[PDB]
Amino acid sequence: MPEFLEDPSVLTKDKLKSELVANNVTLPAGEQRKDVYVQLYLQHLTARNRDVTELTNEDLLDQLVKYGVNPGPIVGTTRKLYEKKLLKLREQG
């Protein structure tokens, strides 16, 4: 669980998606919102890792893939869900 940014919101949606795939994070089907991807990053990492918002859509996916997660391509309303979920994975760290 490599040290992750304490503020991944600075990441783009595509970047967060790769992060989740790089983390072998599995992205549930039926979810395409940026916030969902942002919280998933916080839900998986930050929630256990104890800016993600500045990551670009491309980089955000790179991080999601790293967690072993491969959901649907962040549309524009599910991105927040993934951002929140990411925090959960980050918490695992």
CA 76 to chain centre: 14
Residue carrying the six token digits 């104890």: 50
Of 18, 45, 49, 17, the C-alpha closest to 33 is 17
Residue at 82: amino acid letter? Y
Q: Residue 83 gets which letter from DSSP?
A: H
Domain that holds residue 41: 1-93
CATH number at residue 43: 1.10.720.40
How was this structure obtained? Answer: NMR
Backbone dihedral angles phi then psi of residue 65, each to the nearest 5 degrees: -60, -35
31 within 8 A of 71, measured Cβ to Cβ: yes
Q: How many domains does the chain have?
A: 1
Four-point Cα dihedral 10, 67, 57, 45, nearest 10: -20
82 within 8 A of 36, measured Cβ to Cβ: yes
Q: H helices of the chain, where?
A: 13-22, 34-39, 57-62, 79-85, 87-92
Q: Residue 63 gets which letter from DSSP?
A: E
d(CA 38, CA 31): 12
- Please tell me the total number of residues recorded for the chain in this structure: 93
